[PDB]
A and B are shown apart, each in its own frame.
Chain A
Amino acid sequence: STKSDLPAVAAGVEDQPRVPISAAVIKLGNHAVAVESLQKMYNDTQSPY
């Protein structure tokens, strides 16, 4: 069943505490999507984004 396979599909993703990282998170209705940018990381190294 799907309720019995839920720990089975959870191999190494659940025995982990949740630490906070910073993220600009907006809401589109029921989704809570996170718009971010990484051109700060590519403007240090002078690589084209």
Chain B
Amino acid sequence: RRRLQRRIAGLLPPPARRLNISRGSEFTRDVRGLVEEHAQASSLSAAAVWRAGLLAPGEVAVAWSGWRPPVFGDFLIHASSFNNAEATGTPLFQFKQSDPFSGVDAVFTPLSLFILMNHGLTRMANLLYDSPATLADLVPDFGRLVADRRFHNFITPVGPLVENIKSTYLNKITTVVHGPVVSKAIPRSTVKVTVPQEAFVDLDAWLSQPCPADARLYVALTYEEAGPRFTFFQSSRGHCQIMNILRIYYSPSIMHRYAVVQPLHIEELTFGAVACLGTFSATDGWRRSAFNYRGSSLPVVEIDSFYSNVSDWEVIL
């Protein structure tokens, strides 16, 4: 009954949320304990681990805040299939391979996906990948898998890259599949998801009341007449709205697909699919930039502060 007191005194304390500040010039111990957050990294010493508290269970606590650590999904890829000059924050799209026991993976950035679709944006695609044939056999039968319009249920978005070690023959990437996208380096710095500007469109800008707490990034494969395209939507609504909103936005191209060809078949009838990619702050995100290569540059959409959270593929019609 007193052992329970000493135990419940340790299991009691929630983090002190409010605090009576007196003067901002004071910077006393209470406000430092409010602003201090423990790191996921320290040097391998006894004092550094025992002060950073790396061995704490569940979270990192020196010796439940709305903060959870992320989860990494590491893939091993053919090093020719992934141009290593790409930045940290680019959304990768792992193709579910038809090989039964293959331990090698086939990820795609959307730039590498563009030369897969078609076979400035095209200039940076062909400068980043001089070879449209070593990716045309990663998918073994692209013409069949698109001509029966089942390409959307084979591509699993795995969120953005965070760290990529450049090995020579078989490349190892570390992505973030779910949660808060943040770097793991010895100086920690911010990671920003970069999507190409010509591919990225907006949805509040296309429509031109309330402000939400977060906006959700959407990816959208769609089967047109001239091949598939990977547009990237950003929306601040909910999903069940966005299905009807993109049905309105594609209601031109739905009539165009029924018009320029008549679907005598039955597997052609789907018109793309959309999958949520996660939430970011709806206020100051997607500040544009340009991704500078050795000789050229494409304009890029640099979404800061991503919470990666993949959803599944829902058809559009």
The answer to whether A and B touch directly, with their CB atoms under 8 angstroms apart, is no
List A residues at the B interface (Cβ < 8 Å). none
Which residues of B line the A interface, CB within 8 A?
none
